[PDB]
């Protein structure tokens, strides 16, 4: 090892005496050991792109070869940690140096080698067992929520020569040692994986289970699945935090991985303040979400090669926790700020531009990234199954979905929750547009619904029809004068507003509307569409009978039924049980049926 510096011109260092140095390997330049990466070889010389500031590097300085590309450390110490695109432990730099800056050429391990971890081996394993790549051979009790499963790296195999008893070990002790063909491998609690390589699985399964968020919209009208791909608009004043807060607090996920890819300086200071404050309830107790969450945090002035490799660090962490058997949901905030760092890294290398200056390989990257999500059957013996759900965020200039990044990401992803600012200014929350949003996972969730909530899909189609009809009846009510209104259309324009105001609108600052279970959702939609059906038939039967019914009689014969409909969304799911709310909704149904028979 130990080449030397031959020339420096900007961020580009040239190193001599680097004979056996691989491409895209990482190196440390100078006496402060700045981190850089090899981008070209020529004879005995290597061309290095340095990530930090090269100001002060002289000729003859050392160059240390690391031997591996950009990789991540995977072991106990990830939950509640705060990293960046290079996986530097920000909250440990902050406390070991006692300065408010990130030092230049700082070399600290991502997982601390001081904590003693509680490790218990697999009770069936003994000297002579046949263990392959992926097998869980121990468990570290990370915290009260997450059990950390110790797995063999995906490429090893052999017979157990030694396995450690239960006890306390740090992430440097040899906990396993196996043998193959006369060669020994020692393995500790931490394994290293390159971030640009997909982790192996046994098979990629189709996604057929819902991702419960807790909002009535996004769970009825635009469903996502466990293993899916979503995209939202990341803009100012659109009410965007509902998505990440719902995912973190009330969701069926086990592990959460949040990624900022070059956010503003004060926008990161808000996430790093809010996220350690959210809480969940588990087994009756209240715990912090940072017991099952990891954050990757970059700002606009951090190295451009960390604002680009952030997405890969995040997806590798989530693929590491998917291989244990968990269901992970990753969230990448402002994927556009990643695409811009991509374009800038290209520009530095003097590469031919493509449409709008972005590199040639933009759609290839954006597609091979989202192809890393999904449900899988995990490699290894104890027969588990995991999942990774990716939620990206795009920032189109002025709400224009023609930028190359927005066009590509809308071509790829299957769901699209369209947050709107217009609805936010009207105090309509969650401000989802319901007219430009979509979801193409609705045919995969068909055995699930038909097995668990049989009478739901018809209600979904009916509600979508009603909400579309109230909208394409707009010029009819403006260019004409609200009077030439067939009674079917009066019934629509009233019940659709009932839906818009008492189903699609939810308020998190309450004790009853933070979380809406799905039985409550299907009940609240069934009562509304059943009303609609009965009130529509009552009118269109007595069409020519000299007893013309109009909405004016329907709104006077049932003046409390309508209130109780508009009051369905106050039934607490905790202070009232599930059978109680079911019986209340059934009573309201029978009262509706009565008060509709006592009208004919």
């Amino acid at each position: 090892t130990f080449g030397y510096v031959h020339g420096v011109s900007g961020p580009v260092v040239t190193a001599c005496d680097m004979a056996g140095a691989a491409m895209y390997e990482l190196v440390r330049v100078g006496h402060s050991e700045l981190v850089g990466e090899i981008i070209r070889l020529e004879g005995d010389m290597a061309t290095i792109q340095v990530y930090e500031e090269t100001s002060g590097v002289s000729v003859g300085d050392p160059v240390l070869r690391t031997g591996k590309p950009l990789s991540v450390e995977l072991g106990p110490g990830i939950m509640g940690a705060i990293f960046d695109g290079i996986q530097r432990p920000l909250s440990d730099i902050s406390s070991q140096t006692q300065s408010i800056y990130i030092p230049r050429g700082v070399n600290v391990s991502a997982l601390s080698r001081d904590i003693k971890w509680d490790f218990t081996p697999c009770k069936n394993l003994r000297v002579g067992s046949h263990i392959t790549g992926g097998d869980i051979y121990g468990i570290v009790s990370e915290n009260s929520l997450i059990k950390h499963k110790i797995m063999l790296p995906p490429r090893n195999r052999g017979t157990v020569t030694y396995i450690a008893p239960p006890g306390n070990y740090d992430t440097s002790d040899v906990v396993l040692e196996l043998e193959f063909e006369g060669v020994k491998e020692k393995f500790t609690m931490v394994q290293v994986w390159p971030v640009r390589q997909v982790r192996p699985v046994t098979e990629k399964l189709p996604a057929n289970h819902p991702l419960l968020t807790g909002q009535r919209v996004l769970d009825a009208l635009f469903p996502c699945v466990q293993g899916g791909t979503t995209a939202i608009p990341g803009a100012f004043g659109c009410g965007k935090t509902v998505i990440s807060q719902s995912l973190s607090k009330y969701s069926n996920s086990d592990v959460i991985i949040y990624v900022g890819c070059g956010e503003r300086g004060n926008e990161m200071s808000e996430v790093l303040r809010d996220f350690p404050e959210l809480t969940m309830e588990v087994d009756g107790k209240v715990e912090s979400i940072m017991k099952r969450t990891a954050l990757v945090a970059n700002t606009s002035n951090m190295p451009v090669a960390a604002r680009e490799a952030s997405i890969y660090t995040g997806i590798t962490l989530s693929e590491y926790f998917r291989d244990m058997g968990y269901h992970v949901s990753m969230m990448a905030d402002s994927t556009s700020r990643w695409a811009e760092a991509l374009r800038e890294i290209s520009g530095r290398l003097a590469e031919m531009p493509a449409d709008s200056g972005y590199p040639a390989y933009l759609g290839a990257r954006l597609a091979s990234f989202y192809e890393r999500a999904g449900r899988v059957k995990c490699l290894g013996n104890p027969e588990r199954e995991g999942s990774v759900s990716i939620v990206g965020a795009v920032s189109p200039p002025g709400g224009d979905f023609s930028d190359p990044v927005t066009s590509a990401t809308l071509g790829i992803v299957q769901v699209f929750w369209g947050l709107d600012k217009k609805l936010a200014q009207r105090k309509h929350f969650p401000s989802v547009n319901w007219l430009i949003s979509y979801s193409k996972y609705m045919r995969a969730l068909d055995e699930y619904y038909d097995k668990h909530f049989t009478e739901f899909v018809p209600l979904r189609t009916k509600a979508k029809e009603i909400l579309q009809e109230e909208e394409d009846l707009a010029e009819i009510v403006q260019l004409v004068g609200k009077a030439s209104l067939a009674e079917t259309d009066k019934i629509t324009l009233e019940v659709a507003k009932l839906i818009k105001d008492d189903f699609l609108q939810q308020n998190g600052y309450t004790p009853y509307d933070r979380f809406c279970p799905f039985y409550k959702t299907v009940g609240m939609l069934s009562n509304m569409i059943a009303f609609y059906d009965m009130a529509r038939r009552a009118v269109e039967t007595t069409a020519q009978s000299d007893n013309k019914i109009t909405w004016s009689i329907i709104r006077e014969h049932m003046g409390d039924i309508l209130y109780k409909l508009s009051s369905m969304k106050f039934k607490d799911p905790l202070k009232d049980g599930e059978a109680k709310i079911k019986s209340d909704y059934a009573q309201l149904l029978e009262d509706m049926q009565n008060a509709f028979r006592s009208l004919e």
């Binding site: 056996g20 390989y361 071509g411």
Partner: protein, 460 residues
């Protein structure tokens, strides 16, 4: 045979981009094939892109991540890329480079064929004239397809071009006026949903002992998307011009092929064309599309149906624009018709088939095919003109004939185009529907149909 030992060089002069440069090579041969073994034992393969004296420039199919200039060992094969080809390849699944991914053995070759092919003497061809009946009235009745044609599907992202393709595949057959296709499927850069869809649809709505798949997915090497359609087409040419079968080749997302091609071109700083694509993209797509037709003396054929995705629904982008200059028509899949829940969402005005005039008519389908087609085209265009005039002058400023056109438009889009995804319309049913649509107008408005055809077919 090549009976001499192979030479192995550890003399790498420099790695850069996707290109490795070797020196001290002994009589380097252009387009040769190289086998590289990396310092950690992994194996990759490359092709020589330029030779000069003792230097050779190899382009690795899997990339140059991990290669060094002291321990990577390259072994020169001594010959161009030849693929092993047989007839057992029907009923098998390979990846984009030709290895088995269905837990079976490697191909026991009947022959070894050069995957670049050979341009067919233009004198030894036969003009294709036997019409394929796809059972889709928007293609059969207005953009008819002959057996031997090359006709792509111009679609966009999010539209249903895959189901259109699979329906053509499972419904297609000759016209019965008074035995089957062997499918070769290559996909370049697809996602797992698409491969699952096609595999499930082949082995359910038909048979899988007549299909040969070459699956290169979205998390696979980019530079190996360049040789996948050529492997597919070499297999097709062996099955068609030597074993005398009728092959149907489906190449999915030529856009991903074109983008891998742009990436390799930009890697070594060549002259661009529009929007950065290499200047030789026409001459490169033409070596793929032109391997489709019939020849004199042999009873096989090759019908190609590429599938495209037009960026931003723009048909002037380099990919659709250069594709339309090479192929014999195109089937245009529209977004405006998808948003109205119409299937198949085929817009017939930007569609075309260049071999229709010779495949329809008396003794082939029926005497009146061409006139009905031309009249439907004229009426559809005038209806779409009226539809845009009324958006300015209002509903109540139109004439008595503009309303006839606006009625034709609705009934055409809902009765002729819209079909249903498992419905197989014989071409005579399509022509009867066309005449039922043309009877909206008095026979004097139909100014493209001769009089002796209107005397026989209009009153009925």
């Amino acid at each position: 045979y090549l009976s001499q030992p192979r030479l192995t060089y550890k003399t790498v002069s420099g790695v850069n981009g996707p290109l490795v440069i070797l020196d001290h090579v002994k009589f380097p041969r252009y387009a040769e094939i190289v086998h590289l073994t990396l310092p950690d034992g992994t194996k990759r393969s490359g092709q020589v892109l330029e030779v000069s004296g003792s230097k050779a420039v190899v382009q690795v199919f899997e990339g140059t991540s991990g290669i060094d200039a002291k321990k990577t060992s390259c072994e020169f094969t001594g010959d161009i890329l030849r693929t092993p080809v047989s007839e057992d390849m029907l009923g098998r699944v390979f990846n984009g480079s030709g290895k088995p991914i269905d837990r079976g053995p490697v191909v026991l070759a009947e022959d070894f064929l050069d995957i670049m092919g050979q341009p067919i003497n233009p004198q030894c061809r036969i003009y294709p004239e036997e019409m394929i009946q796809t059972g889709i009235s928007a293609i059969d009745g207005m953009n008819s397809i002959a057996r031997g044609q090359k006709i792509p599907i111009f679609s966009a992202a999010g539209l249903p071009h895959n189901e259109i393709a699979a329906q053509i595949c499972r419904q297609a057959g000759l016209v019965k006026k008074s035995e089957n296709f062997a499918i070769v499927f290559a996909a370049m850069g697809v996602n797992m949903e698409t491969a699952r869809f096609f595999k499930s649809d082949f082995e359910e709505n038909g048979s899988m002992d007549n299909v040969c798949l070459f699956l290169n997915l979205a998390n696979d090497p980019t530079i190996e998307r360049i040789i996948t359609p050529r492997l597919a087409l070499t297999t097709a040419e062996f099955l068609a011009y030597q074993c005398e079968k009728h092959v149907l080749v489906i190449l999915t997302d030529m856009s991903s092929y074109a983008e891998a091609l742009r990436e390799v071109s930009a890697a070594r700083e060549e002259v661009p064309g529009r929007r950065g694509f290499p200047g030789y993209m026409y001459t490169d797509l033409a070596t793929i599309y032109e391997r489709a037709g019939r020849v004199e003396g042999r009873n096989g054929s090759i019908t190609q149906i590429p599938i495209l995705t037009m960026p931003n629904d723009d048909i002037t982008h380099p990919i659709p624009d250069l594709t339309g200059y090479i192929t014999e028509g195109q089937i245009y899949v529209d977004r405006q018709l998808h948003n109205r829940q119409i299937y198949p969402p085929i817009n017939v005005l930007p569609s075309l088939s260049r071999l229709m005039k010779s495949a329809i008519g008396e003794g082939m389908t029926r005497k009146d095919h061409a006139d009905v087609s031309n009249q439907l085209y004229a009426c559809y265009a005038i209806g779409k003109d009226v539809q845009a005039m009324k958006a300015v002058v209002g509903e109540e400023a139109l004439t008595s004939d503009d309303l006839l056109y606006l009625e034709f438009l609705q009934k055409f889009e809902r009765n002729f185009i819209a079909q249903g995804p498992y419905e197989n319309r014989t071409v005579f049913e399509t022509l009867d529907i066309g005449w039922q649509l043309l009877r909206i107008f008095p026979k004097e408005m139909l100014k493209r149909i001769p009089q002796s055809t209107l005397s026989e077919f209009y009153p009925r």
